[PDB]
Amino acid sequence: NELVQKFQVYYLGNVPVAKPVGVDVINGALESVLSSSSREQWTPSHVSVAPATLTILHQQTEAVLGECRVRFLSFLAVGRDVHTFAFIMAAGPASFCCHMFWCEPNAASLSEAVQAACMLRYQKCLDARS
C-alpha cells in the first residue's frame, strides 16, 4: 500500500477553487481558510502517500478524512508561509477542490512525498500504455 509512513500534520480542510493550477489559487484558498479558523479548530491528521492515492486520516484513530487519486491531482504547492501545503484535485471534469494542510516544522517532507508520487505515477502510466 503506502510508499512512506503517514505524515502527522494538520488538515485545514478543503474548498472549491476556480482553476486546476496556480500558486495564486492555492494561496487565495489558504488565506481564506486561515482567516476563518483558529489553531484549536485544526484537525490533527496523517497523510498516507500510496502509489495511486493520497489518503488523509485523523491523527491516531486513523479514520479516513479524504482519499484522492494521483491521476486527478492537477497541482500542488507549498504556500508563501512555509508551513502550508495545498493540492488541487479535479473533483469532476469541470470542478476543482483545494485540500490544505499546516505542517510542522514545515511542509517540505509532505510536498516532497506528494510530488514524488505524481512523478512515479506519470512514468507508470506512460509505461502501461506504451
Partner: peptide
Amino acid sequence: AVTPEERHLSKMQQNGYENPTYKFFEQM
C-alpha cells in the same frame, strides 16, 4: 549556501508542481 530542503521549498513556493499524470489523461 542553500540546503536541499531549502531549494526544493522555493521551487514548491514559487511555481508549485503541475502533475503531468493529470495532463496525460486530460489530453485523452
